[model samples]
Target: MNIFEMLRIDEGLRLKIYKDTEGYYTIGIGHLLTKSPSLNAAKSELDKAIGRNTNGVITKDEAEKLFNQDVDAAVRGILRNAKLKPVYDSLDAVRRAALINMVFQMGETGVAGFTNSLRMLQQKRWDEAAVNLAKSRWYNQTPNRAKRVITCFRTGTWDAYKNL
Candidate 1:
């Protein structure tokens, strides 16, 4: 959960890497798909971050330096590390991934550090966890995204894969 900066090989190659078969990568820095020939520079930065961790697979920060350091700090220091409590003793891979995205969007200090959502989940309180999901910064910041994630967290289906 780089909090919004990881470029997975798949998404990167198709989305960010654009023109993949062209034998290189690139990221859209401007409007929608700014023509930045390649992602040589940013990819290098991201590569270095691949080996770091923020808090379990639930929140891992890429160690790239080309970012708003202060905000990233806020995400890490304030959010991810803000809570030492656990959220899952038995979460499936995708669920864990979704939560990490949720926490990344919410900020560690803003939500993870506090007592409520994650705490309930850690305790295996599914109802409480579901409720906490709705009561998060995600709900406050990005209601739509929150709804989508909450749906998955509740139903445990990434959705009827084809419909989405």
Candidate 2:
């Protein structure tokens, strides 16, 4: 599946604001507005999109739009990283989407810190990469999501969503 579809399932949508796992005030599809300069602009845009005062609520269409923007940002961010760009370009669509998912959950810098894992991925050492990922704090913090990502890396397929 496409990155958008995959993220829609992984992130899960919410029409109204809610506290994320880190307690940040977030809106539709994991859009974190906390401390964001665009928060007010987003609020205004949401009001316009919903045809009323949104008051922190957004329509499905608007949410999808935001998700698209966020995904694009993640992709661009990943590519912008000098070390990651080559690795990202070497992967197939499925693995690319998995990498994007990692950037989506954590910023490019966070993923960049996976030095050994990134090296393994760059070398196409899939099993080694997966093992490195399994040893990360990210895996401990979000085991299910990390497992899915690791499995995608290891198998080079879209098997992460098979049972879903």
Candidate 3:
């Protein structure tokens, strides 16, 4: 199974998408981030828990989790019906992967809203593209992660990825 496929939370994981006194769709991980002794377990569970909810953008309540999980559900929903051609037209594989990560985090609607960033990416403007990408609301949230991935992307080293 693709790691992503394996980690996605379905009806399992005791999913509890609820609304407040008002009406809004939301979810929450069972607890806050993991502690040292529970870190591995936390990573495994969160890999699916937050990973699933990170469809487009992080919901207000969902954003409370301290993991690097500010996804955009709007972008993910858009990608569901998205033509692969556009994404394939992108020249950077790692950037494409980052885009997938973004979709996995945000959602398709969030991605589709990125008119200029997408254009820069397709045109192979790495520096400008990176700058544009860093301007999102999610920017600076995952400096270590973004730096690591950008390095791997810049050097084309798949083995360079460390634990996240």
The candidate scoring highest on lDDT is 2
Clashes of each: 7, 0, 27
As a TM-score, model 2 comes out at 0.87
Per residue, candidate 2 scores C-alpha lDDT tens digits across 1-164 of: 77877887788999987767766667899877664445676676556644688888778888888888889899999889997898899888889989999999888999888888888888999988998899988899889988988888999888888767
Q: Highest TM-score: which candidate?
A: 2
Candidates, ranked, TM-score: 2, 1, 3
Worst 10 contiguous positions by lDDT, candidate 1: 54-63
> Candidate 1: where is the Cα deviation over 4 Å?
1-85, 88-90, 160-162
lDDT of 1: 0.44
Q: Write the per-residue lDDT of candidate 1 for residues 1-164, one digit (tens) a residue.
A: 22233222112212232333223333321101223454555445334443432221111122223223423443344333525324533566555655655444444555555477667656666666777777655577656556666665676666522243
**Span of 10 residues, lowest total lDDT, candidate 3:** 5-14
lDDT of 3: 0.46
For every model shown, what is its TM-score relative to the native structure?
Answer: 0.46, 0.87, 0.45
Runs in model 3 deviating more than 4 A are 1-85, 149-156
Model 2: per-residue Cα lDDT at residue 101? 93
Error of 2 at 112 (Å): 1.3
**Residue 98 CA error for candidate 3 (Å)?**
1.8
Arrange candidates by lDDT, descending.
2, 3, 1
